[PDB]
């Protein structure tokens, strides 16, 4: 349904994880796979968008947008940005809850830390809607630096 994309520039490492969420999504929330890759997009224009490696990307990547929201023809989380922001922060909130109650369980694992580093990424996503709040980029902040600790604490 959507092409493979380039490989990723060397520029864009920053946006790599995001567009990993995206393809880890196309089957289940497609929405979520529509905007990881807008952001993505956005966030990869304002980093190069001269050098000609960034330049074909960011078009092929601008391809597979063009063709997500057809194959999503109207659906209120692409028709509306109120919607979408919801679907997406509500997704991302969940996810966070989740993760959170694990670590306060003391259970650790692979799938905990996903939904901590996933969570943040999530939420970086949200600001192609505009500012985030304050509880908004505590919860990213903490999302991200819990994902790091317990990494590195359970390959040490």
């Not at 063709?67 to 991302?92: P, S």
């Amino acid at each position: 349904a959507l092409a493979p994309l380039p490989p990723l520039p060397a520029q864009f490492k920053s946006i790599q994880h995001h567009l990993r969420t995206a393809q880890e999504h196309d089957k289940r929330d497609p929405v979520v796979a529509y905007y990881c890759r807008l952001y993505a997009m956005q966030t990869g224009m304002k980093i190069d968008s001269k050098t000609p490696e960034c330049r074909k990307f960011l078009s092929k990547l601008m391809d597979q947008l063009e063709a997500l929201k057809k194959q999503l023809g109207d659906n209120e989380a692409i028709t509306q940005e109120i919607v979408g922001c919801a679907h997406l922060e509500n997704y991302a909130l969940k996810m966070f809850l989740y993760a959170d109650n694990e670590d306060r369980a003391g259970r650790f694992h692979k799938n905990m830390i996903k939904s901590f580093y996933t969570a943040s990424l999530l939420i970086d996503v949200i600001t192609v809607f505009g500012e985030l709040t304050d509880e908004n980029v505590k919860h990213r902040k903490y999302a991200r630096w819990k994902a790091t600790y317990i990494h590195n604490c359970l390959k040490n």
